[PDB]
Design a protein around this nucleic acid. Sequence first.
DNA 1: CCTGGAGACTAGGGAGTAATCCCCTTGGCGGTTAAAACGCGGGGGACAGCGCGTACGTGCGTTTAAGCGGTGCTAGAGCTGTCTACGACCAATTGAGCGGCCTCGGCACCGGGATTCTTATATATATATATAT
DNA 2: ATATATATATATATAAGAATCCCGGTGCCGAGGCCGCTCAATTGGTCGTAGACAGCTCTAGCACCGCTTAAACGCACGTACGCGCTGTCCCCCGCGTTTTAACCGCCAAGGGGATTACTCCCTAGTCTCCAGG
Lengths: 105, 97, 92, 78, 80, 80
Amino acid sequence: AKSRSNRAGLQFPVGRIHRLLRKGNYAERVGAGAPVYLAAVMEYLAAEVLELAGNAARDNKKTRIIPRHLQLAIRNDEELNKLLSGVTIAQGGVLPNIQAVLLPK
Amino acid sequence: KKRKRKESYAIYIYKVLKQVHPDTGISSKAMSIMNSFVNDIFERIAAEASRLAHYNKRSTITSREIQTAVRLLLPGELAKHAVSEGTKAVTKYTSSK
Amino acid sequence: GTVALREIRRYQKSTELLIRKLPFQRLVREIAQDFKTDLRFQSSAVMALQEASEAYLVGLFEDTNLCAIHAKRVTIMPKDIQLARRIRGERA
Amino acid sequence: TELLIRKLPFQRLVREIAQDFKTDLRFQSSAVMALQEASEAYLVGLFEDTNLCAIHAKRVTIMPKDIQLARRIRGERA
Amino acid sequence: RDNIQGITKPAIRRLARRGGVKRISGLIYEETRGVLKVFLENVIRDAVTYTEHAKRKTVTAMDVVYALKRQGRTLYGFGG
Amino acid sequence: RDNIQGITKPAIRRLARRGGVKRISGLIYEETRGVLKVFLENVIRDAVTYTEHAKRKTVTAMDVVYALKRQGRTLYGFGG
DNA sequence: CCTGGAGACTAGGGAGTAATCCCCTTGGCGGTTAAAACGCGGGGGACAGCGCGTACGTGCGTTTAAGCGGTGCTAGAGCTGTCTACGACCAATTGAGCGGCCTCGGCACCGGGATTCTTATATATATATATAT
DNA sequence: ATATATATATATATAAGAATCCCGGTGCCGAGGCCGCTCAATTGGTCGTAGACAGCTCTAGCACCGCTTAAACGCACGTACGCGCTGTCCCCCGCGTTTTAACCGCCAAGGGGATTACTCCCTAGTCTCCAGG
């Protein structure tokens, strides 16, 4: 009658998340509240990532998100750079900064 | 004849983008890059929950293992936000149940 | 000096691959034939290897510049890269 | 193989830090021993990297900028 | 009761002798205490998380081993 | 054919500009080549090892993803 | 004087042999074009060295608490039993997402005017030097 | 010592060579919306083992005091060590030139992810003989 993503109101597939959890060789029994928790947490994290990427795109006056926007969004955010420390973003780079001793006088 | 049914998180996060920035599109290769991001965090914290269930010698993973994985791996406010929305995600999952 | 400073600000905002893809493909095939010959390759694998190597080299050059600044210099030497790889743990 | 940090001030410091998170936490002596061993083995490598940076800075006296470079290359700062 | 000064100056000096340092400046000790403070704010908090997930208030060494292997610091000793 | 000379020193200088380097010495390129050959004999050997138990001589990008995550290098890109 | 155990014949299920659908690469061939190698000048930064402040190294006097050890108190970790309840699983249903095809506008691309940048140089001004009573 | 006159050096505009953006027009290809349908989600009974809870226990953690002795702090002098600085020279940067290899394009052929005509090996149903109860 009602799908669990519609029932919980989350945008993420609770059924697909639970299906990956059951075949993921983590536990012989997987609870019902855990995929809802996982879907809500990943939904908010993806919403934060898309929000910062949209802010970076509006800074670059583009309505299409490029990985340079994600590169400038993750690394500028402190907790995103701290969590995604070893993450390398494809088609990106570094934050544009100039060292003080390399500056012209 | 199509090749295969490749399942992805394209339309869900596309709806997330449309409810965050309705007038902003996204390139598909950046979409697959952050799909790899989402699946990587899934495989990180699901293994974290499995390890925490192994530490309790428990063969069943509840939402409490996911709570411990969130408050261990996520630093700063992204921990305590994701806990706070994660409890109320359960309650609306158990309201009309 | 200033002309050398001009491309410093230019390549910090560009996300294009500085290494030409065909010599990189030749080098990947030359390395891979040493392990096991007659290896078919996808182009996406070569592109992922090229972007990972370029990002790792950019980070290592950032650490090299940090070591050169720490030694009160603006010119880099290989001992900066040696110290960066030793602190990074990449030194075997 | 001896420990240059005394056990009782270190245990006082550990319980002082743990009181900030959760009040009334009982502690094993083995937990304090493992924390002291891990912290000492971590700081010995920190002093080795600091000495390597000071040698790279052509000095025999260590400086805070050596630790600043060593932890930045190590990536311990967020 | 503050106990960050319990890590006394000859203790850090002897550890720097173990660390292979000939001369130690006078202001190294404050940054050493700060880095040890950061490390012990991380590991002890992770151990509190491991203990509260185990429904205990008694902090064990095995939770310390869990917190150390979570951060990639593999140790061979007590706990197992 | 030796293709280690295909990494031209203008490209290494451009990587240094992207890496933020003011002055580049002439002998930086030799150790740069020595570093990148080690980096391309670690990950490539790991990818061949991942492909070998897949029973193929066709190298896929997912083997490169597995090789990169084996060594801790997290890449969000080609291969998924 | 009569029914059931057992060897032989045969229908059905299933996985190995080899060919195939077609798809992705792929060396090879030919035109193009722009990035690299090379070299000349020069310039500015790494380096040597010499002196100069100076700051931990050591050592002894004074303090001091770490730790051993013994005793007592006790908080909860863990074991045992007992109920229970929620997911695992099987079978039927059913609609959501994936693929494919059209389509249309967001952004790549050229380009000249406006915008800085920079950088040697013109010019106003501070100062060292020469002469004499 | 001071008045008069000259010339060298220095700071700031400054104007012209040089690189950058951006508004203006053009396209094109990759987002982004509709059909077909499929496969994975949903719903439902059952049961069975994971888990929560009551109670004991015992076992390690906590506290506290004698004592004593290694450990810590602080003053004193110094001597080796960090640091400015002045030549220097040499190695790397700025720019013109060849060339050469990267890029683009195509094709024919072959390996291969997956699928399929065919085919022999394993398994169970059925028929008739003889041997027993």
